[PDB]
Design a binder for this molecule. Structure first.
Ligand code: ICS
Ligand code: CLF
Ligand SMILES: [Fe+3]
Ligand SMILES: [Fe+3]
Lengths: 522, 477, 522
């Protein structure tokens, strides 16, 4: 029954008495459900420490992972160049998943193509599929470059991308001067950040391998910047603004911010902005190359230091206060341009916010997860704020990164209770926050279920989630926020302090019970 | 120590002032001598502020409505006059209470006459009567009404006393008019006196012919504790665990019934001298109730005050006091053991108007911290008589210090911490000196008693030792 | 009792058994409290329609007002000029309260002085107070200008500032050429915005009334901008950015964003930025003057039209889409500069964000309050999003403003249920949201006590609050945000849609009760 003046969606229509009775009838008649007491007892057992031991003894089962496969990052990297069509050599089903993932996160149209390989191509290879796909894509969508990636199936079969592309070139399917870089991105190696690294190295090698004769370091007086797997537009914006504000000639390779924030003015632009091909060609002429995310740009660093002959600096991700300062000082030293008064004014304002909010920020316990560099810089910033990161989780981390984070933690008195987990999934984190409760969680939308679990144990056991990372699905337009630099530090600080104060306001809203602490001024 | 260069520092700071301002301000800055019992020969207080020097003092309306009458929960306080005076003072003070707001408690509320020009010109008393009628209509569970007058009420000429009498007789309910105009008095100090006079004249003598209260020989009354962050409850639990029964609290979490029942009490426990010594003296003269001052800041002062209070009763109360001291010894001993090493030997400057700076000094010294300078915006000469013994030799004393004077003193002395109000918090946070909001406990607390000492120590450690203070200077500067 | 490892603040220390027993003993013994049944009955009575009628039959008593007094706005206006000291002729409690209010909102130092008028000045006037205060302030704090406003005390006793200031100048207290503009700001007339208008008019008249012989409109080819009572730093920043992006020469008058956002670098800057006196002298040479908030800038409009001979455009506040477009087009027409492609891209991005989030915003009921111009712009923007304002409140609005808002509502199918109230306070709004429940409230922090009240009636009767306006005390660094232009519209849209999504997420967190709608993707 629905009222025409007040129409109810699934919630709370299915809370009606008739729907409740029908659900109860179904459950008691045909579902053969376990008794409610048994369910409650099993749930209680899942929150105990013995369950945590059994869950940490897992060796083959992965539950609720916090990472994706390489071609997703490869497609994101391919999206950062001008009029470049991301091409995935493999079956068509996974390209749809990539597009759906990026559509749900960015809330923008994402363009990608696949050659739709089938078991007939599985038994004989995908050479003809590659030829037809290249020809059809070039004829239909008119790109100036096609970046080729591999689905895990083409990797298991063992298709040679170079041979297939060359054969397509010499048989008239595509013009011989058409740039078609390729990269091998096995989905069973690393994660999406590794795919981004593979695709970027493939494009750089395609554009700057055979032309390394008329190349002099520092000719154009520009600095190359590689952003890595970045899902915040504000990060690209802040890097560009910080570099242009102090008069430093820069060259942002693979920036997708223009194509992922196109305006809605009655027309559809499939391509917009990006890195030009001449920009990639002129890359080795730069004085130096700066990697914003070194810990997943290892192969790119190897190629840059081995072919471009660029002395890549030992720089962390520009997140926090000390690391942003170090990045600015290194760029100033490389380019010879002094840091202007505006940047130091911004730094002073950020220190002002830290000083104003240290009282509420001090001592709070956070359990955070995400990509390695983002996680490590977030831990550094939390240690700068006097915060306590107790559970640090990185599914796609390695022992080297874990040792680096341990060295970072040991240099601060607030890292005494900090433990770093690599290779562990979100079920491990659920057990961790159940057996050692922090004050808040910091991660993507996939943590929103863990919060629910805690709320079932009790209100006093709930661990609220703070949505900072990738992917954020349940909130709108959070991809436009900033994460790197002073501006990103201000945004993160504001989010943390306001989440803490909102939690306090919720906890102290009980009239005649806890409203004695319902302060107007906080 | 080092009184000579602090004297010369006072001379240098006083050099920018005009001759008259310099001459007056020279009397309010002093060098502490602990061997002095009469501060009148060293410092001068309770004088008017020099115009245009950015004083921190307030008005008598703040010291009456916002301090004494505000914490009373079941009464309705009407800010008679323009809106702003009650607007800026709404919920700005963390006097904690238990009650259903808007039904039987009205502390965080703002009732005001909201005077317009036609009210400024044509009377205003009939508006007050209509306001009282509307208040009785919409808020039937209130147990009294106070009318705190603002600046224009006295200026235009109004008789709120006749309206109070007439409406109290008509509605059979107490109405207390308080002539707490801002221009009356040089600071909040006179507001305390005016509010105390209003309580004495309109509330205190209500239950004089009543003898239905069953009084016990252990009855006490907490006077001068306004429950900031729950301070009064932390003192109350210690007093009750000692075997005493408290029937009144003045005025944090207080009620009209506690005020009316206070004259049936055997001992008056006065925490804040400055704000309630008038009513304590009146109740001593009239009802013969003795009164004493106590201090619950830090463990040493808490133990001293507990023993002094127990000394006024029989031996059972003393044994109970020993029991509670033994019970609470390990708690504060552990707090000291944990927090003193991080705070040992660090210098602090204080500037809170009224009783708090002399009281907090014992709690600071308990954690190995030393107070190098102190002062009160509105304290009188008896307060300075009381605080000279507490403070160390050749330390700085100021009274109604201006913004420039305080900033110069802080820059020259360079203390490790400053405890003061919101008006100077960000000024000193810009210069890189850790700051604590003594008036509001930086939205933390309570600080009274053993339960409050742990929170005090944790707060001071979290503020003084915060890493943010080491990033003030850019690495490329 | 405290544990040295887990120290508890007031909450939840006062939730222990001993403290609860102590409070119960206090209440039962020496409080004469009403029975809980009576309290519950009266609370339920307060949420009825008859109680609303009694509440709206009020004429003398105002409970929980939503406005301040004039000298607060006078000080805010005075703070926006270079090295200008706000001076309040009257009592010192006014200045103390103003400084505390602004410190609590902006979390920044606020400088203001008073002459500390007392009973002696109440009897014999405050001439000597003014002389001594001017001399002392000039000698000590060394300002280039002193901006004088009045306290209600000085207004009732008829202290005229002109004669006092002239007497001080001619008797040697201050130099004759020292600029001391003055204004009369009675607290019983209007509100803080009226004080801002009065003080700005006073300063403009001081600097321009006697030099109207060599001023020709359009000589300096700039456009004057008058922001009005503004407590958002982003609102100044966005206007500066949008005007500089168009290449339009402009002159911001009374901009305090610099002094209100000083950096923390070990030094205390008591003066920072602000409009110089030269720009105030050259103000009538501008092509035109634009008033950003015309509903509280009427007197300065009369002064500008009558004296400066400027044809002030009839423009609304640049809030939303249509009004920002009109502001940009009018500025382009006045200055002759075309609107660049960056602003078109920003508008397209705003429209894209509107279309992406239109599903969750349609049909939502809002009860909002604030200042006349801000409230009108907010209602307009809510109408452009498909939202439904229901209770529109303005304690400092007049009949003309209410008629204009009614006309705005009539031109949209979403304004039928909307009703405008002028002269009402927050108790009236509590009654309105109890008897006609909206979905959300939009206002300053004073609305939080309303939310608690609703929560006392029930979880399904609670009306959450969104903090947009002045003053915001319970949250940190929200004064850094924007409300004007496309940037401000983007931020407001993000806040509204994410508040709605967070409320929906909260309502569907119970496992096996309502979690079937706890969707990962929204
Ligand atoms: S009443 Fe006084 S200024 Fe004794 S007006 Fe003031 S809640 Fe201070 S140092 Mo705010 S004489 Fe109380 C005080 Fe002390 S408001 Fe509180 S902190 S102990
Ligand atoms: S010293 Fe005290 S607080 Fe000041 S006015 Fe006087 S009673 Fe009041 Fe309120 S209304 Fe505004 S701030 Fe004043 S100027 Fe007229
Ligand atoms: Fe979109
Ligand atoms: Fe600040």
């Amino acid at each position: 029954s629905q009222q025409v003046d007040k129409i109810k969606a699934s919630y709370p229509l299915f809370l009606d008495q008739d729907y409740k009775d029908m659900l109860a009838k179904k459950r008691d008649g045909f579902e053969e459900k376990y008794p409610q007491d048994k369910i409650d007892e099993v749930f209680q057992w899942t929150t105990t420490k013995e369950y945590q031991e059994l869950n940490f003894q897992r060796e083959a089962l992965t539950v609720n992972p916090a990472k994706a496969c390489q071609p997703l990052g490869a497609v994101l990297c391919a999206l950062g160049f001008e009029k470049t069509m991301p091409y995935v050599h493999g079956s068509q089903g996974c390209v749809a998943y990539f597009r759906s993932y990026f559509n749900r996160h960015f809330r923008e149209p994402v363009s990608c193509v696949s050659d739709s390989m089938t078991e007939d191509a599985a038994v004989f290879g995908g050479q003809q599929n590659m030829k037809d796909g290249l020809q059809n894509c070039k004829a239909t969508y008119k790109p100036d470059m096609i970046a080729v990636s591999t689905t895990c199936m083409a990797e298991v079969i063992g298709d040679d991308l170079n041979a297939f592309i060359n054969n397509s070139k010499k048989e008239g399917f595509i013009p011989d001067e058409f740039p078609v870089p390729f990269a091998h991105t096995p989905s069973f190696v690393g994660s999406h950040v590794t795919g981004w690294d593979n695709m970027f190295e493939g494009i750089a090698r395609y554009f700057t391998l055979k032309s390394m004769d008329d190349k002099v370091v520092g000719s154009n007086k520009k600095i190359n910047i590689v952003p890595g797997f970045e899902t915040y537009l504000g990060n690209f914006r802040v890097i560009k603004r910080m570099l242009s504000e102090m008069g430093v000639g820069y060259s942002l390779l693979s920036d997708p911010e223009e194509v992922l924030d196109t305006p809605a003015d009655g027309q559809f632009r499939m391509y917009a902005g990006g890195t030009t091909q001449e920009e990639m060609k002129d890359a080795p002429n730069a004085l130096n190359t700066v990697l914003l995310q070194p810990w997943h740009l290892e192969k790119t660093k190897k190629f840059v230091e081995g072919t471009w002959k660029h002395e890549v600096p030992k720089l962390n991700i520009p997140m926090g206060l000390d690391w942003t300062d170090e990045f600015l000082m290194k760029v100033s030293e490389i380019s010879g341009q002094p840091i202007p008064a505006s940047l130091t004014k911004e730094r002073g304002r950020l220190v002002d916010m830290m000083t104003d909010s240290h009282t509420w920020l001090h001592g709070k316990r956070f359990a955070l997860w995400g990509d390695p560099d983002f996680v490590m810089g977030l831990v550094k910033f939390l240690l700068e704020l006097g915060c306590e990161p107790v559970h640090i989780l990185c599914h796609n981390g390695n022992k080297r990164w874990k040792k680096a984070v341990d060295a970072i933690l040991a240099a601060s008195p607030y890292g005494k209770n900090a433990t770093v987990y690599i290779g562990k999934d979100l079920w491990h984190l659920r057990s961790l926050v159940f057996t050692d409760k922090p004050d808040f969680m910091i991660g993507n939308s996939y943590g929103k279920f863990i919060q629910r679990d805690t709320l079932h144990k009790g209100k006093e056991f709930e661990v609220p989630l703070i949505r900072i990372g990738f992917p954020i699905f349940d909130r709108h337009h959070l991809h436009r926020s900033t994460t790197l630099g002073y501006e990103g530090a201000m945004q993160i600080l504001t989010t943390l302090v306001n989440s803490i104060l909102e939690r306090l306001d919720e906890e102290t809203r009980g009239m005649q019970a806890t409203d004695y602490n319902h302060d107007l001024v906080r | 120590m080092s009184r000579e260069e602090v004297e010369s520092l006072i001379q240098e700071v006083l050099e920018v002032y005009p001759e008259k301002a310099r001459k007056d301000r020279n009397k309010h800055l002093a060098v502490n001598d602990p061997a002095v019992t009469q501060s009148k020969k060293c410092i001068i207080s309770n004088k008017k502020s020099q115009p245009g020097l950015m004083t921190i003092r307030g008005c008598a309306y703040a010291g009456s409505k916002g301090v004494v009458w505000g914490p009373i929960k079941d009464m309705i306080h009407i800010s008679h006059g323009p809106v702003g005076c009650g607007q800026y003072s709404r919920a700005g003070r963390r006097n904690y209470y238990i009650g259903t707001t808007g039904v039987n408690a009205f502390v965080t509320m703002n009732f005001t006459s909201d005077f317009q020009e036609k009210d400024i010109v044509f009377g205003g008393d009939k508006k007050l009567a209509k306001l009282i009628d509307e208040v009785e209509t919409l808020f039937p569970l209130n147990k009294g009404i106070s009318v705190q007058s603002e600046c224009p009420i006295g200026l235009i000429g109004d008789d709120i006393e006749s309206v109070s009498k007439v409406k109290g007789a008509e509605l059979s309910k107490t109405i207390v008019p308080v002539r707490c105009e801002g221009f009356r008095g040089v600071s909040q100090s006179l507001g305390h006196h005016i509010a105390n006079d209003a309580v004495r004249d309109w509330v205190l003598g209500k239950r004089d012919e009543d003898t239905t209260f069953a009084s016990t020989p252990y009855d006490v009354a907490i006077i001068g504790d306004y429950n900031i962050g729950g301070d009064a409850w932390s003192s109350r639990i210690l007093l009750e665990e000692m075997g005493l029964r408290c029937v009144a609290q003045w005025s944090g979490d207080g009620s009209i019934s506690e005020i009316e029942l206070t004259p049936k009490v055997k001992l008056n426990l006065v925490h804040c001298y400055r704000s309630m010594n008038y009513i304590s003296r009146h109740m001593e003269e009239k009802y013969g109730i003795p009164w004493m001052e106590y201090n619950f800041f830090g463990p040493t002062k808490t133990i001293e005050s507990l023993r002094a209070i127990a000394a006024k009763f029989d031996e059972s109360i003393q044994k109970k006091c020993e029991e509670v001291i033994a019970k609470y010894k390990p708690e504060w001993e552990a707090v000291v053991a944990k927090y003193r090493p991080r705070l040992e030997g660090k210098r602090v400057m204080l500037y809170i108007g009224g009783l708090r700076p002399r009281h907090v000094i014992g709690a600071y010294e308990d954690l190995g911290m030393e107070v190098v300078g102190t002062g009160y915006e509105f304290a009188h000469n008896d307060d300075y008589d009381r605080t000279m013994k507490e403070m160390g030799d050749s330390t700085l004393l100021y009274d109604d210090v201006t913004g420039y004077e305080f900033e110069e003193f802080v820059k020259r002395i360079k203390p490790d911490l400053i405890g003061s109000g919101i008006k100077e918090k960000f000024i000193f946070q810009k210069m890189g000196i850790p700051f604590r909001e003594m008036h509001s406990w930086d939205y933390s607390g309570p600080y009274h008693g053993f339960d409050g000492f742990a929170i005090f120590a944790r707060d001071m450690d979290m503020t003084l030792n915060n890493p943010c203070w080491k990033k003030l200077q850019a690495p490329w500067e």
